[PDB]
Amino acid sequence: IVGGYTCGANTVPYQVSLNSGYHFCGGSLINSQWVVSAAHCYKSGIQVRLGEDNINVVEGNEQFISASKSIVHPSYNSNTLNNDIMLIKLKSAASLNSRVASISLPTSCASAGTQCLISGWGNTKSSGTSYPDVLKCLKAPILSDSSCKSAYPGQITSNMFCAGYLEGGKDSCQGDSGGPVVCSGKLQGIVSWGSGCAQKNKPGVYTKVCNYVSWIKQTIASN
Ligand SMILES: Nc1nc2ccccc2[nH]1
Numbered sequence: 001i002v003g004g005y006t007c008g009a010n011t012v013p014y015q016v017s018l019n020s021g022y023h024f025c026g027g028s029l030i031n032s033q034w035v036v037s038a039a040h041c042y043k044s045g046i047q048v049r050l051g052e053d054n055i056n057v058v059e060g061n062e063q064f065i066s067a068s069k070s071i072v073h074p075s076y077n078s079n080t081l082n083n084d085i086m087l088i089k090l091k092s093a094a095s096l097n098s099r100v101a102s103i104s105l106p107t108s109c110a111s112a113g114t115q116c117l118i119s120g121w122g123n124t125k126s127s128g129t130s131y132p133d134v135l136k137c138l139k140a141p142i143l144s145d146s147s148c149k150s151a152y153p154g155q156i157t158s159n160m161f162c163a164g165y166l167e168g169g170k171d172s173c174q175g176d177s178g179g180p181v182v183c184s185g186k187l188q189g190i191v192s193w194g195s196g197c198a199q200k201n202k203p204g205v206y207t208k209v210c211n212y213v214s215w216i217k218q219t220i221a222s223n
């Protein structure tokens with residue numbers, strides 16, 4: 001997260017860290033046994049880490065659970081990143097409390113102008129790499145489809161939306177991939193892609209979760 005602030009320990013209880021010997025992507029807990037992340041974060045050997053703040057120190061509240069299966073959307077296109085969403089089933093259920101909790105899926109999509117909270121342990125520098133130890137937060141608005149399409153002509157599908165600042169300076173970045181974009185208490189986006197991080201007129205692009213709720217429900221119901 002570039003231009004964000006320190007969230008504060010366990011203030012984002014649905015945030016998870018996907019770990020394979022190091023943190024490589026974020027995700028959101030949507031129930032005690034399932035996590036939603038981005039398809040491009042797929043790999044085998046994933047350990048899901050819940051209740052984290054400093055990812056390099058066991059401070060208490062952490063729950064490390066192995067993933068039993070990862071289900072990448074069948075229509076995910078790695079060249080266009082269309083349908084960039086994945087569900088991860090945990091080997092055992094997580095214990096939910098105030099520090100570890102799930103986030104609700106939306107019932108309707110959000111409108112441009114909606115202010116959302118984006119969080120993660122990704123890079124904090126636009127020109128260079130500095131990975132933080134603790135969780136960073138950024139409040140950002142959803143942009144209109146015209147501004148998004150004008151920023152990324154020919155690359156935005158109906159399953160994506162832009163959020164951020166056109167002046168640059170604040171944005172998600174590598175390492176934040178798969179993490180949450182929450183607006184009014186509902187998970188509306190998943191950190192997917194962008195051109196660089198925090199560059200002027202190149203806002204971040206997110207997977208539009210409201211378009212996948214029935215898919216998520218049906219898939220969880222059958223697995
Ligand atoms: N804004 C933005 N978000 C990103 C997520 C992964 C890689 C680069 C990115 N740029």
Ligand SMILES: [Ca+2]
Binds near residue numbers: 052054056062
């Ligand atoms: Ca920790």
